[PDB]
Design a protein around this nucleic acid. Sequence first.
DNA 1: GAAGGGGGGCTATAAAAGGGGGTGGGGGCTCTCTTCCGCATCGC
DNA 2: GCGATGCGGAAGAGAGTCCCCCACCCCCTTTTATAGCCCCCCTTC
Lengths: 48, 88, 298
Amino acid sequence: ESRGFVENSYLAGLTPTEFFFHAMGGREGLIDTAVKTAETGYIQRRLI
Amino acid sequence: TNYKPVANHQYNIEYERKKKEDGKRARADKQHVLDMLFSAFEKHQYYNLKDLVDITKQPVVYLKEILKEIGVQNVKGIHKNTWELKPE
Amino acid sequence: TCPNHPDAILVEDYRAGDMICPECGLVVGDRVIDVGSEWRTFTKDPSRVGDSQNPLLSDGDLSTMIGKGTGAASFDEFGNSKYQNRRTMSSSDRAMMNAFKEITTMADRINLPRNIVDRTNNLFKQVYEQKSLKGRANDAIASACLYIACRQEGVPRTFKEICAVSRISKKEIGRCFKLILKALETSVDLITTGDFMSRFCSNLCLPKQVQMAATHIARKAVELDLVPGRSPISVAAAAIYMASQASAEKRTQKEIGDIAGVADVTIRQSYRLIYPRAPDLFPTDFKFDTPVDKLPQL
DNA sequence: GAAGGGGGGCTATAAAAGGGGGTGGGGGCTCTCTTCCGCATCGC
DNA sequence: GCGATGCGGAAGAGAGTCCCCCACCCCCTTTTATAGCCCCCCTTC
Ligand SMILES: [Zn+2]
């Protein structure tokens, strides 16, 4: 529980710590999506 | 109460009154100016024209004309060219 | 320029980007070129043009200033930067630039709107170029131009009010004012007592009813010729004093003189001329806190 | 000693005279590639 | 004894995402009429 294991389902709902830790995990995906758009775009241009 | 309407500023009437009271510098005779001019040279070897005018209390044009006849300008690169009260 | 339509006014279809004959619809010429900026104003601005040149600058030039050094190559052997900005502004432009700065400084002191400042800047440029006042100080010309601009805009300031915001005295402003009118071959409408009521009464913190009463009293007094030859400011100050003394908000002669720029003696003299016919001058629908009969007699 | 009063100066108008002074206008964030320096090595 | 030089490592660039002098003009001054305005001193109580 302390290190971010969510023992609840989405239907059950997340506890406040689980909700925050889940938000921390979700932020990583959002950062990657913003990073992935530009990181791969430069690779495509150089290959072409 | 700021910038209240006024016909003339107090600092300006005082300066105007002082200038009127003092009056314009008069053109004295050449002999008296020369005598006073050389007495000044005694205190200091070199004199600036702006400061020299105060000692003589004479018009700038009149002072330059008399100073030009005998005085000469020496060019100093450190600050600027000034006048020399030595005739030679 | 339709070949089959001598003297025909072509119509610009901006969306279609072409010039068309309004009669036959023929398209004449090439595509219309948008002369505006090719970029958009919404990271650094992708602008490749300089700031608009000042319209009020005789032979105004355009130039670029060297920025601050960044690396060691930008700095001389001993600290000071080797690439230093140089003063390349014309003497005429430099003086004109300083006058506009002085014009704005005075205007802010008495909270004049920017439109009056713009009118003043234009007035100074004409006088500065006309060169009839070349012997007078630029600040006096700017102060006189500021006075003329206020008159031209219908919101006159008194010579004393302009002198308060200017280092130049009232006498020198008045002298430059006459010369500027001669040089420009222009005139200013005569000032009336109602040209100062709003500012004088608002600065004295008088209600609208008292301001209206003062405006009526001065206008009626002038029409009745009870103050012949009196300065309009002196009449207005006396009218404000009369209206002020007839309402709850009562102001002393010293208070009204300070805002009006009129010595309390002058207010007393003008007031004494309109006091005899006080009931006639006051508006009919005026609520007298102090009855007109019991108004000050002095 | 506050306040009104009286007298006088200031303002503009022209004009002449002559000179001093005031005013304005010139001038003496990360990755990659290149360059320089110290060292140890041989050579003669 | 007497010089001479290539390579590794460090550094560093470089690209991508004011004070003075010299004309010119104004005011100094005098006279006078005009009148409103305003400073200053006097006087009142
Ligand atoms: Zn046509």
